[PDB]
Amino acid sequence: QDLYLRELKDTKLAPSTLQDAEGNVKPWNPPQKPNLPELELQGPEALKAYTEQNVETAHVAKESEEGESEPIEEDWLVLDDAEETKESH
């Protein structure tokens, strides 16, 4: 079917210069190469944050400590205030 065959061959061929052989695109005056594989190759990381979100920041946990390892001047005040709270108990 020369209807079918010639329509389908032009259907394959006129984008075959756009996809198979990298001859840019004869009918399009803007180019096709510096849009998706060059400019928006950083597209999703122009859609997300670069260098913290996509590099993902393997970050060390900020180390919190115990109560500064001082169990004298605070525990005896706790025991005196506990005398006070038991006088309230």
Next chain:
Amino acid sequence: RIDSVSQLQNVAETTKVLFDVSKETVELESEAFELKQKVELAHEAKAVLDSW
């Protein structure tokens, strides 16, 4: 006063367990904190590959 003191019969034997097991159940979860670090890292990795 006998009854008021006898309310405090076995307090110390049990509160020496209370104190220790209470502060252990407070403070045995820095493992979970450092697990949270890995969880949010894999969270960000899943998010960015969802973006890709």
